[PDB]
Amino acid sequence: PEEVVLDATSPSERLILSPKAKLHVNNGKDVNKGDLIAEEPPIYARRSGVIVDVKNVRKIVVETIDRKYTKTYYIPESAGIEPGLRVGTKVKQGLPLSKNEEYICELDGKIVEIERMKKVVVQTPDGEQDVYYIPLDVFDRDRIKKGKEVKQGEMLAEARKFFAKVSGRVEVVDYSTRKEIRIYKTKRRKLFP
């Protein structure tokens, strides 16, 4: 294809997505930095009720080096998250992910996703609660606020769009519990007829 990806090349972006995500690329496609590559669907209220809490949280997903296991943590910003945690950070089992040590890491591995979100709690008229985690990118502070009424089926947040952070060739992987897009840098191959 004139340009190829070496089997030794590691991805320049590895995007982790919900299993409901709509992919806008396919295996082997070349993309340019800034191209649309995926969209997560809008977030809708499952039941009518009133918003009783809106809280800043950090979602952190950790994966073992062999990729056999992952854990996902939703940690309140108030528990204290070190500013040095980012994608690629190496973590160890038994060490705290929060300053107050209430959240402990359960795997040796690396952080593969870390994102600021708003935890939104809706309480139904008969006293049940639903919990939503809304990415900051699609959070609207005028509509999602304590005391606001929501109705079954109402959109709480728009679909979230994802654009390539780098140019290269796409690999898509589909698991039961998530989708990923990896983008790899390519190398020019020798003109061979």
Side-chain angles (χ1 to χ4, degrees):
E2 265 156 351
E3 300 252 351
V4 300
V5 180
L6 276 6
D7 199 41
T9 299
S10 63
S12 298
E13 181 183 357
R14 178 185 174 194
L15 172 63
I16 309 292
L17 294 160
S18 120
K20 293 157 50 190
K22 171 62 177 177
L23 298 193
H24 288 286
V25 291
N26 59 293
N27 240 22
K29 189 183 179 191
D30 288 335
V31 303
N32 281 129
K33 178 172 178 168
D35 289 354
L36 178 70
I37 60 185
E39 286 175 310
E40 293 182 330
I43 300 187
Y44 300 101
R46 172 171 81 104
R47 297 187 282 186
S48 297
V50 60
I51 297 176
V52 292
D53 194 11
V54 179
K55 185 187 291 301
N56 296 318
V57 305
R58 192 83 59 96
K59 173 187 184 185
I60 301 173
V61 177
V62 166
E63 174 191 73
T64 56
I65 306 298
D66 63 22
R67 310 207 167 167
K68 293 201 179 66
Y69 305 105
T70 69
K71 300 271 185 187
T72 299
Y73 300 100
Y74 291 98
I75 309 184
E77 298 280 0
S78 55
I81 292 144
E82 110 143 73
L85 298 187
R86 38 105 186 162
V87 174
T89 291
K90 292 179 174 171
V91 295
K92 292 196 149 290
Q93 186 174 24
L95 299 187
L97 289 168
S98 66
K99 178 200 187 298
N100 68 1
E101 311 203 324
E102 296 260 337
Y103 295 83
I104 304 297
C105 186
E106 293 162 286
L107 300 172
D108 292 328
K110 285 179 185 177
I111 291 176
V112 291
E113 185 183 328
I114 174 166
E115 270 226 300
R116 297 178 169 79
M117 306 188 77
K118 297 283 190 169
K119 180 198 197 189
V120 178
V121 180
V122 175
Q123 192 167 300
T124 69
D126 53 16
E128 300 176 27
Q129 286 180 348
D130 292 325
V131 176
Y132 301 86
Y133 288 102
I134 307 189
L136 262 177
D137 282 321
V138 296
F139 176 66
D140 182 339
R141 67 174 59 188
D142 282 334
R143 78 154 154 269
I144 300 312
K145 74 200 327 292
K146 276 217 266 299
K148 274 31 217 178
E149 257 98 3
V150 315
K151 307 81 185 177
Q152 181 193 355
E154 170 179 352
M155 181 183 301
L156 302 176
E158 301 271 14
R160 180 181 179 193
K161 290 179 234 54
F162 298 83
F163 300 88
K165 286 178 310 185
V166 302
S167 300
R169 183 156 303 158
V170 165
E171 186 185 37
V172 163
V173 312
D174 201 322
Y175 306 113
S176 158
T177 53
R178 69 175 193 264
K179 289 170 178 209
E180 308 187 4
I181 296 167
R182 292 88 171 270
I183 303 174
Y184 296 87
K185 290 306 191 179
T186 61
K187 302 295 187 63
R188 169 148 180 75
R189 78 162 160 169
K190 174 142 304 181
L191 8 162
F192 250 140

